[model samples]
Target: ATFEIVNRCSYTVWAAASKGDAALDAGGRQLNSGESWTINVEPGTKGGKIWARTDCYFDDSGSGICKTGDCGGLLRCKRFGRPPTTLAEFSLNQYGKDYIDISNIKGFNVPMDFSPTTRGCRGVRCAADIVGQCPAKLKAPGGGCNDACTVFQTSEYCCTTGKCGPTEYSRFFKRLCPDAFSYVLDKPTTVTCPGSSNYRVTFCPTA
Candidate 1:
């Protein structure tokens, strides 16, 4: 299986992926505009996410920090990217299909497109301009937008326990990118493709 990380954004993005129980590529690499990084995911791999870090500064040894999506100040993220990050999540070969989604549940830092390369499969994306128009309350410090759950941290906002549904905050995101994940209870955002198929994930896709 493979994930083609394509950077179509105007600025450079630090593409990152987790290697199962660890960080892949020690967590640091630069993907300039129009460039792409193909990450091979071994068959049977499960439970990992892909994201882009913006405004990051790292030395040759891969140590430093990022303005957005900082992962414990390490170039190689040993865990998921921090909040205010746009995410493309995947679970390969589970229940006969590859489940994928472009999630803004942690809030959006960039525009993204996620689609299968295999014929006959559909794709889902959230390529809207969210940052500049982000709501005042949900805006991040340096950049990006914040999820309601992250800001409020309430069971109602987070849907931590029982059944929780969309609120005004969630609606804001849903209305913008109806096909992409807006919150934890978001179901319509998910898409399934045949297992082992190659996929393409683009940041800042053109209109």
Candidate 2:
């Protein structure tokens, strides 16, 4: 499978991906408005995540911090990095289908769209005014909104135990981005497509 990352935000954004042991797109790169990048999703890849970093400035050596989704100052992140960032999650060829979704479990940053380029499968997007309308307690610094799990760290939001489910905070995201996941357990939100489909991931998508 392959993903084409497109930046449609009005400002600069640094795109990132985590594919097992390797960092897709050499960890990530800065995408000015209208810039795009593509990378192949190797076989056997599972639980891969694609997301973006905002308000970043890397010095000549590719080392810098992003205000959101920083990923340890390393351009190509091998980890999921920090929260308050929207995630494009996918599992390729898993159980005879390619499952993908725009996950808000982590939180929200730039608006995103995850769509199949072929097969005409349903596309999912989360492009609401999540940043400007973020709940006061869940608001992040400068940009993005933090998930209750990351900020509260309580069983109510964490769901580390068996008694947790959706909360008012989760609904805050769900209300805006119905196509995307509002929390970790928001199931069946996963969209399936043929394994042969090449997908497009866009930031600040209008639709």
Candidate 3:
């Protein structure tokens, strides 16, 4: 019985395994589980090094991959008779501070749409009160602030006051970038803003 090297993390493998003096074939090659492949072994070795190959193509500097998109999910091999190991295991906190250039201020006007919920402010991070953190703000019910103006049921924009929370307005006024799941999280979605301007900062209202 040999212990197989499983890539439980989301990222792909770059290096392969080694057994003391011998180099395992699994090294430096792509080894997505469930995919059948053979490695030349001593035929009697019990344990050795198991390596995988992957790219930094996905976000997180190749530390992981999205469970659903891009690299797809992890596959398992049948030999172990154990449940298949999964990849792309990332926490929401892992995606914080990730920015998206929706307006493309640097001479590249690539219009796009983003959801604050999927972005920087979501889940417990989402601001339920009108005056909370990051992206939620405090405002009168159904009304938006000078900066942020979202009452998104899915985002922190909608606050406990039934209006835009303080953080919501702050994010809008500051023109903070949206989160990854909100913007660049998936394949880039290009779109033109309504009206005369080719770009639109939904987070910010007219100055």
TM-scores across all candidates?
Answer: 0.94, 0.95, 0.20
lDDT per residue (tens digit) for residues 1-207 in model 3:
122233332334333334434444432234343222344434333333232323313333332432111122222211111011111111111122222122211101011122232222321111122222223332322222212222233344323354433342333423333321121122332221211111111111110
Q: Which scores higher on lDDT, 1 or 3?
A: 1
Highest-scoring model, lDDT: 2
How high a TM-score does candidate 3 get?
0.20
Overall lDDT per candidate, in order of appearance:
0.83, 0.86, 0.25
Clashes of each: 2, 1, 34
Q: What would the TM-score be for candidate 1 when compared with the true structure? A: 0.94
Instruction: Between candidates 1 and 2, name the one with more favorable lDDT.
Output: 2
RMSD to the true structure for each prediction, in A, is 1.6, 1.4, 20.8
lDDT of 1 by residue, 1-207 (tens): 877889999899888887446765444468998898887776666777888899998888788888788877777777777889898888888877888888888899989998998765788889888888889999999689999999989998889897798888888888889987888888666787888878898999873
- Candidate 1 regions exceeding 4 Å error are 24-28
Please give, for residues 95-179, the per-residue lDDT of candidate 2 as tens digits: 6688889988889999999999988478899999998999999999758999999999998788887667889999999999998
Residue 158, model 3: Cα distance from true site in angstroms: 55
